[model samples]
Target: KETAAAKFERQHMDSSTSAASSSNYCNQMMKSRNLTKDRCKPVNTFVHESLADVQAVCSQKNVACKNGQTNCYQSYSTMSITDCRETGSSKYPNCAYKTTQANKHIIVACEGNPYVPVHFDASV
Candidate 1:
């Protein structure tokens, strides 16, 4: 079974990427990363920063989650990221996405030993 920690790292961590110029980035990654199986992931973000920096978000600041959870926290500094949004015309088994890059203070949910990020809440 895939753990939340594993899933978060697989879906969000990409510390080596530079700014993306192609809209196909999400399309390529979504498939390669196995995010597209039963359906396309609607919206996702890939952080282009270090793991240590990203993990530190847990101690930045408390925030309300979209579902009213209390585990959310925001980053202190802006980080490079790529946002993948499913296209309106996209269909199952033929997943497609639009890629976008931005610098924002990210929000995340943390958990476990060493207090690492486990889920993406949003980018602030």
Candidate 2:
């Protein structure tokens, strides 16, 4: 069973490297990260920064989540990230995506004992 914090890391964390322009990047990443397992995750984002840096976000200023939850926090600095949007032609079991890279401040929901990010809220 995956905890929300772990699931957040699995779905959004990507400190290893970076890229876009190549749909193959999203095709491979979305699958490799398990977003394509059950079905194409219509839209997703990957943060190319250290886990510690992301974890530190929990200590930042509080913000409301997309659903208006008050447990969210926004990063103090813009970060490297990749956005994957499902292509209109995409179909189940053969997910396709358009990748876009950017540097922006991110907002995420935090929770639990260590107060780590548990959900990606938005990017600004």
Q: How far is each candidate from the true structure, as Cα RMSD in Å? A: 1.2, 1.3
Q: List TM-score per model, in order.
A: 0.93, 0.95
Clash pairs of candidate 2?
none
Candidate 1 structure lDDT: 0.88
lDDT of 2 by residue, 1-124 (tens): 9999889999999888854546577888899999999888999999988999999999997998989789999999998889899988899999999888899999999999988999998999
Top candidate (lDDT): 2
Candidate 1 segments whose C-alpha is farther than 4 A from its true place: none
| lDDT values for all models | 0.88, 0.90
**Which portions of model 2 show Cα errors greater than 4 Å?**
18-21
Cα lDDT, model 2, residue 29:
89
